[PDB]
Structure 1
C-alpha cells in the first residue's frame, strides 16, 4: 500500500534529465504537473489505434473512440463521487468551467441587489468571470476577509454572506497560501442563505480525495494538466437540477437535438454543454491519469504531500531573512520571499542550479496586495518529489542569500 517514491519517479521520463549541468529539481507542479508513461502511452494508443469521431457508433473505430470517451466520463464521475454522468461536463480546463457557470448560471440568475461573494485569496479564474457577471447584471461583488494567517473564519463567511447572496465562489485549496478552505461548512452557510456554492478545485483535485456529495458543492471545477493528465482538458461538475435549468454556454453540432432555420432544441445532459467535436484524446488521457492516481491512492498522495510540506516549513524556518506566507496546516506548496532579493532573481538563480520554481503574482494580484508584496516565489510539491529535493532548494536559497549579500 505505501508509496515507493523511487518506483513512482521511474514512471515520469521528464524527471530524468539535467538543466544547466544539474539534475532537474522540478518544484512547480502547482503551475502544471508532469505525466507518467501510463498517461502518455494512453494518448499514443488512442492516436495509433482507434482515433475516430465519437457518438456516431456506425463503424468499429468510432465505437471504440466513443466507448473510450464516455468511459472516461464515468471514471471522472466515480473519482469525485458525483451521482451521475449527467453531472460531469468535459471542458477546456478550470477556467472555462468557471466561466460557464458565470455565463449560464450567474448572468441568468442575478438582479440588482443580488450578491456574489468571493474571497481575497482567489485565483483570477475565480475572480474575473464574477466581476463581468455582476457588471452585466448590475449585481454586487463582495469579498470574505482573511485571518492574519491567510485562512478563512466561518464567522467572517456568515457575516459576508447575506439573504441577498446568490453565489459564493471559493477555492478548495489556495495555489499561493496552501490553505485548505472549509468548503463543506461554507456550502451549508451558502445554502442557509439561499445561495449556491461554486468550488474552484483546480489545486485540491490533484492532491486529495474529492467527494462532491460530502462537500455538497453546487458546482466544482478542475483541470487535467495539474493532476498528471493532458493539457487542454478540465471538468465542470454541477448538481443535475441546476444544470438542467441552465442554458448552454456554447452552441453548435453535437449539443443539439433538432435544428430548424431559426430555432433549435438541445441534447440531454451532459452533452447539452459539449458543443462541437470534443477533446477526445485528452479526456481519455485524463481518465488514465485518474486510474494512475487511484492505483497509488489519493490518501497516500495526501500523506506524502503533508510530510513534504511539514519538512519544507521546518527547513524554511532554519533560513534567516526568509518569509513564508499562509498557515501551518497546508497543501504541498510554500510561497515565500527572501529579504532583500526580488523573487524573479531567486527563481533565475535557482534555475541555474536546476531547480524550477515560479516567481510572480501566481494569478492572484488581490492576494499579493493583501499580503503587501508585489510578487513572491513559490515552490510546489507533488507525488514524485522528495525531501532530498527540498534540501537542494533550501541549500540553494541559503547560497542565493549569501550571493546577493556579497554582491552588495
Structure 2
C-alpha cells in the first residue's frame, strides 16, 4: 500500500511554515505540487539535452526529440489511446477545449444544431461553446442537475436530441466533487448523432482514465493538476475526428508544403502542434505520469476516497457548515460557514497555515444554481493526510467561534 510519509518526503514544497504554522496545502484542485522526480526531469533536460525537436538532427536535437515523442507515448499508454496520432500536446485543458470549439464545433454547427453542456461546468467548458454557437447560429442547452448536484441519465436523454451535435461535460466537478457518468453519457450522445467532449482536468490526476472504455470523442487534461509542469496539457481526440479537423494554429513544424498563398499540413499529431513545442514541460509531464503509475492510480483513488469520506464525516460534526454536492465524490469539499463570508474563512485559515480557495471557482452558473455568490473549497491529493483534515475542521470550529464573539 502507499506510504504517505514516503510520498510527502518527495515534495520539497510541503516542508515549510506559513505564518508560523506548518503549511497545510488543501488547494490541489487549483494546482498540484511536484515531486523531485518531476523537477529533476526538467533540470536534467536543461542541464544535458535541450535542443529544438523535429528540426536539426544533431546529437542533442535527437535526444530532445526522442524525449518529447517518448513522453507522447507515455501519455498515450496512460489514458489508453489507440495511437500517438490521437495525443496532442497543448498549453492546458482550457486550450484543448478551445481547439475543439474552434476546429470542430465551428466547422460542424448550423442553425438548429445544439451543443449540450451542464450547469456544473467550469468556465473553460462553457465559454468556448457560447462563442462557437454565437459564431454559427446554433443553440446552447444545459442538462439540469439533481438536488445533490449529480446528473441523472433521464435528464441527459431528455436534453440531448436528434439536433444535438456536441455534448460537453466534466468527468469530475471542481466544485461538487461529482464524478459524472461519462461512459453512459457517451452512449446517449452517439445514439443521437452527437460527439462527446470530456473535460478531464479534475479526473486525470486522481483516477485511471481509459478513453477506449469511456468511448469519449475528445478528452482534455492539464499537467499542472497531476504533479506535472505548468504550461502543458493534452487534447485527446479519436483519430477519425482529428483527421477531418483543420488546425487551430498555423506555423512551423505543422506543415508539409508552404507556397506563397497555400500550404498543406503534416500528419497527426503534429498537424495540431504549430511552432516550437512545450519541450521541457511535455517531458516533465511524462515524468509525472511515470511517478503516478509507480504509486498506482487505483491506490491514489482509494487514498482520496478515504480522505473525502473522513472530511465529509468531520464536516458533519461542525454546526453551521453547509457542504455542497453528493456523498460519493472525488477528493474535495466545497462549503460555507453560516454567517461568515468564504473570503474571510480563507483569510483566517491561511493565518493558521492552511491553504484553501474561496470564490466561485470559475463556475459562476453553478454558484447561481446553488443560490450562493461564493464558497470555500478544500481539495486533497496524494500527499494529504487525515491529520491535515483535522487541522482544517479545528480551524473552522475556531473561525466560527471567533466570528460569533465579535
Common fold by TM > 0.5: yes
Q: Secondary structure at the match of 1:148?
A: coil
Post-superposition CA distance 1:185-206 (Å, at most 9, x none): 0000000000000000000000
Quote how far apart the aligned CAs of 1:56 are. Answer: 2.5
1:367-387 residue CA offsets vs partner (Å, 9 max, x unmatched): 000000000000000000000
Q: Which has the higher mean CA deviation after the structures are superposed, 348-357 or 50-59?
A: 50-59
CA contact (8 A) 1:57 1:66 kept: no
Q: Specify the alignment match of 1:237 in structure 2.
A: 236
What are the Cα deviations for residues 202-247 of structure 1, in whole angstroms up to 9, with x where unaligned?
0000000000000000000000000000000000000000000000
Contact 1:35 1:228 in 2 (8 A): yes
Contact 1:81 1:213 in 2 (8 A): yes
Q: Which residue of 1 aligns with 2:120?
A: 121
**Distance in 2 between the 1:58 and 1:121 partners?**
47
> Secondary structure of the residue that 2:366 maps to in structure 1?
helix
* Equivalent-residue separation in structure 2 for 1:346 and 1:44 (angstroms): 38
> Aligned equivalents of 1:181 and 1:353: distance in 2?
34
Following the alignment from structure 1 to structure 2, what is the Cα–Cα distance between the partners of residues 271 and 58? 17
Aligned structure 1 segments of 4 or more residues deviating by more than 3 angstroms: none
* TM-score normalised over the length of structure 2: 1.00
Q: Distance in 1 between matches of 2:154 and 2:400?
A: 41
Q: How far apart are 1:44 and its partner, in Å?
A: 0.2
Where 1:217 maps in the other structure, the secondary structure is coil
Structure 1 distance, partners of 2:396, 2:203, is 27
Write the distance in 2 (CA, Å) between the matches of 1:175 and 1:214.
23
1:59 matched to 2:64? The reply is: no
Secondary structure at the residue paired with 1:136?
helix
**Mapped contact 1:124–1:364 kept (Cα < 8 A):** yes
Q: CA deviation at 1:90?
A: 0.1
In structure 2, the partner of 1:319 is 318
Q: For residues 122-170 of structure 1, give each alpha carbon's deviation from its aligned partner in whole angstroms, at most 9, with x where no partner exists.
A: 0000000000000000000000000000000000000000000000000
> Quick one: distance in 2 between partners of 1:82 and 1:348?
43
RMSD over aligned CA atoms reads: 0.3
- Looking at structure 2, the residues matched to 106 and 150 of structure 1 have their Cα atoms a distance apart, in angstroms, of 27
SS of residue in 2 equivalent to 1:272 = helix
C-alpha displacement of 1:7: 0.1
CA deviations 1:252-311 (Å, max 9, x no partner) are 011000000000000000000000000000000000000000000000000000000000
Task: State how far apart, in whole Å, the 2-side matches of 1:56 and 1:89 are.
Answer: 18
What residue in structure 2 maps to residue 163 of structure 1? 162
Instruction: Please say which of residues 54-63 and 262-271 is displaced more in the overlay.
Output: 54-63
SS across alignment from 1:198? strand
Q: Relative to structure 2, which stretch is displaced further, 52-61 or 75-84?
A: 52-61
For structure 1, the residue ranges without an aligned partner over 5 or more in a row are none
Residues in 1 aligned to 2:170 and 2:55: alpha-carbon distance in whole angstroms? 38
Question: 2: distance between equivalents of 1:91 and 1:54?
Answer: 16
- How many residue pairs match? The answer is 406
SS of 1:176's equivalent in the other structure is coil
1:343 maps to 342
CA distance in 2 between counterparts of 1:236 and 1:56 reads 23
2:105 is the counterpart of 1:111: no
Give the CA deviation at 1:58. Answer: 1.8
Secondary structure, counterpart of 1:235 in structure 2: strand
Deviations 1:93-112 (A, max 9, x none): 00000000000000000000
Partner of 2:51: helix, strand, or coil? Answer: coil
| Alpha-carbon distance between aligned partners in 2 of 1:149 and 1:239, rounded to the nearest angstrom | 33
Where 1:3 maps in the other structure, the secondary structure is coil
CA distance in 1, matches of 2:345, 2:2: 32
Partners of 2:167 and 2:135 in 1: CA distance: 18
1:390 and 1:57 mapped to 2: Cα distance? 52
Q: 2:361 is matched with which residue?
A: 362
Is the 8 Å Cα contact of residues 53 and 277 (structure 1) preserved in structure 2? yes
Q: Using the alignment, how far apart are the partners of 1:331 and 1:96 within structure 2?
A: 24
Per the alignment, in what secondary structure is the counterpart of residue 89 of structure 1? strand
Report SS of the residue matched to 1:184. Answer: helix
Q: Secondary structure at the match of 1:390?
A: helix
TM-score between both structures, scaled by the size of structure 1: 0.99
Shift of 1:57: 5.1
